[PDB]
Structure 1
Amino acid sequence: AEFVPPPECPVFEPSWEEFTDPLSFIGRIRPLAEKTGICKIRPPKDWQPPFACEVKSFRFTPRVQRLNELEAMTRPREAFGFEQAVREYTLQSFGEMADNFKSDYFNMPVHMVPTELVEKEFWRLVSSIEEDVIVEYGADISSKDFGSGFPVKDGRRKILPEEEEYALSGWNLNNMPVLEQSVLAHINVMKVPWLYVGMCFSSFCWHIEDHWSYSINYLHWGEPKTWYGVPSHAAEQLEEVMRELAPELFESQPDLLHQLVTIMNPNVLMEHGVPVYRTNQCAGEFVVTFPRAYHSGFNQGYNFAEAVNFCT
């Protein structure tokens, strides 16, 4: 049985007038987008920010992902835990590895592999015990390490005159409001975007953000990032289904720890009555996750994303 793609989440193509500030736009589209958990926003055609990361020094140690680790629990192999150690890549060397992996895996040029094929094969590999596929995920790279993907007027990197509008734009993830209101905030006497370098099959589990926060994600360049989302009204329904289908050894684990391994086929959630929506986030497009909207996904290939939590 092949994977059945969930219905598509809403995609918005705002005009220049509607693109004037994100918080007003997200607040207007919320009656529809909050019913799907996630939504995609395509900026106007002429809105093309530069890539402002320090590429000459960009290096990272991506985490190793055993895609079928949950299904493998039904088997202890000899010397388990020593499968593959983490290594350091550059932005170039990671891309060379990523493109070579995908082209070798599908026996096709990387740009010719349909998004539906990677999606179908990803969910087959997750539940396969006959094949052990291992990928790497350059996740949790702080924008403070090598700079944000967006230009920032902090004096650390040169900004051309035609790039200044992107350093001051409200859609620049460094210009999103992040300070939550509370009484403690008036008693005590800092959040920044995070970067994610992906390859084919690199994935993130079903989870919600801390404090049920909104999140916005921008794909600077590369192959698409495939998303799955669940609206907040079905959050407790997903949690009960996920706990019933997770291994019994993890069923009583707290949410913050359970979310570290929650890779689950969306078709199984949909069969249990959970509404799920999907999207392919392409280069230059935004994805907004709404409060308490569970979401997961994987990368179609070598790409570079930036994400931050924002408050309303």
Structure 2
Amino acid sequence: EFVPPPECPVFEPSWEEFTDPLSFIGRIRPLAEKTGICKIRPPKDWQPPFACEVKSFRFTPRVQRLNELEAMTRPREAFGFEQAVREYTLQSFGEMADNFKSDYFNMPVHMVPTELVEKEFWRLVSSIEEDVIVEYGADISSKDFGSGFPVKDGRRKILPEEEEYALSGWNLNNMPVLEQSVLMKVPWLYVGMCFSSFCWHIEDHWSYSINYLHWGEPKTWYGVPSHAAEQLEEVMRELAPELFESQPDLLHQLVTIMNPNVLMEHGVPVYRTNQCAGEFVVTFPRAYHSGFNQGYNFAEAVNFCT
């Protein structure tokens, strides 16, 4: 079955090192740049409150058919109308997500080993006999219902115990986002359920990205260092569906799902991590990454510049 890639680096900075994100990322770069991704665990006392407007938080998630590329191998009757379209609140999405996972594995959602969800995910992606369909609240703009981090503005109220987090350099709203040049830049939200996923991609302009899991079950990641970017792209073209082979990268990476073991078999280095609630994941410039969610969770991401 699936062989898990080696673990990416995890850093546990002291309060002194936790002072400036860009200074810290600059210092860990000699190691983290060689794995493409790294995980950062903040000091134990660093616990930002969740600041989204939860009562009015409503969204229509995207439908994900795990084996859609494998099923390209007579089209189905009335294709394009498989799943009925559902709108959710945070609470009703969570109820759906937990019922899906507990029903799927026949055990309570917190008892399912992360290694089993991983093994099953990659089996389902390549399975022609079983068609599993899930939903992902992905790419929700933080301008919609606010950031998960507290921010200083007239939108909501900030308590004194909250203000340190509104002002923190690790608040994703306070990251630098303006690239220097001769002359949408806000965080985005992701409401996950078991098996919801993001396929292999790099960021626009080869940007760094930083990713925070506010709460919930882990987000499983795979990363490739930037020195292997060209090798991954060559493996993709060789093994991607012929109909998509000529597509430009920006469109191709909407459907570049590929088992990490296939890349490893072709000599591409791949690292993994389970990002748990309260942890950051940083992706380095031109570091390909992909992943999936273990269950109901809430993440926030932003592209930043150095």
With normalisation by structure 1, the TM-score equals 0.97
Residues 239-289 of structure 1, C-alpha deviations (whole Å, 9 max, x = no match)? 010111100110110000000111100000000010000000000000000
Q: How many residues align?
A: 306
CA distance in structure 1 between the aligned counterparts of 2:219 and 2:85, rounded to whole angstroms:
23
Do the aligned residues in 2 keep the contact of 1:140 with 1:196 (CA within 8 Å)? yes
Matched position secondary structure for 2:69: helix
CA distance in structure 2 between the aligned counterparts of 1:75 and 1:266, rounded to whole angstroms:
30
CA distance in structure 1 between the aligned counterparts of 2:241 and 2:186, rounded to whole angstroms:
35
Residues 131-154 of structure 1, C-alpha deviations (whole Å, 9 max, x = no match)? 000000000111111110000001
CA drift of 1:81 comes to: 1.2
Matched position secondary structure for 1:56: coil
Do the aligned residues in 2 keep the contact of 1:140 with 1:195 (CA within 8 Å)? yes
2:5 is matched with which residue? 6
Question: Runs of 4+ in structure 1 displaced over 3 angstroms?
Answer: none
CA distance in structure 1 between the aligned counterparts of 2:252 and 2:84, rounded to whole angstroms:
23
Matched position secondary structure for 1:55: coil
1:285 is matched with which residue? 279
CA drift of 1:78 comes to: 1.2
Does residue 1:296 correspond to 2:290, yes or no? Answer: yes
Q: What does 1:1-312 correspond to in 2, within 5 Å?
A: 2-74=1-73, 76-184=75-183, 191-312=185-306
CA drift of 1:84 comes to: 1.1
Matched position secondary structure for 1:69: coil
Do the aligned residues in 2 keep the contact of 1:64 with 1:85 (CA within 8 Å)? no
CA distance in structure 2 between the aligned counterparts of 1:70 and 1:191, rounded to whole angstroms:
31
CA distance in structure 2 between the aligned counterparts of 1:75 and 1:22, rounded to whole angstroms:
53
CA distance in structure 1 between the aligned counterparts of 2:76 and 2:266, rounded to whole angstroms:
33
Residues 190-229 of structure 1, C-alpha deviations (whole Å, 9 max, x = no match)? 6100000000000001000000000000000000000000
CA drift of 1:99 comes to: 0.1
CA distance in structure 2 between the aligned counterparts of 1:99 and 1:71, rounded to whole angstroms:
27
What RMSD over aligned residues (CA atoms) do the two structures have, in Å? 0.7
Matched position secondary structure for 1:204: strand
CA distance in structure 1 between the aligned counterparts of 2:223 and 2:35, rounded to whole angstroms:
7
CA distance in structure 2 between the aligned counterparts of 1:181 and 1:37, rounded to whole angstroms:
23
Do the aligned residues in 2 keep the contact of 1:68 with 1:128 (CA within 8 Å)? yes
CA drift of 1:56 comes to: 0.8
CA distance in structure 1 between the aligned counterparts of 2:280 and 2:211, rounded to whole angstroms:
5
CA drift of 1:86 comes to: 3.0
- Point out where structure 1 has 5 or more consecutive residues left out of the alignment: 185-189
Residues 3-46 of structure 1, C-alpha deviations (whole Å, 9 max, x = no match)? 00000000000000000010000000000000000000000000
- Point out where structure 2 has 5 or more consecutive residues left out of the alignment: none
Do the aligned residues in 2 keep the contact of 1:221 with 1:305 (CA within 8 Å)? yes
Residues 59-108 of structure 1, C-alpha deviations (whole Å, 9 max, x = no match)? 00000000000000117111111111432100000000000000000000
CA drift of 1:155 comes to: 1.8
CA distance in structure 2 between the aligned counterparts of 1:169 and 1:155, rounded to whole angstroms:
18
CA distance in structure 2 between the aligned counterparts of 1:243 and 1:109, rounded to whole angstroms:
40
Do the aligned residues in 2 keep the contact of 1:38 with 1:230 (CA within 8 Å)? yes
Do the aligned residues in 2 keep the contact of 1:62 with 1:138 (CA within 8 Å)? yes
With normalisation by structure 2, the TM-score equals 0.99
Identity between Structure 1 and Structure 2 (%): 100
Matched position secondary structure for 2:209: strand
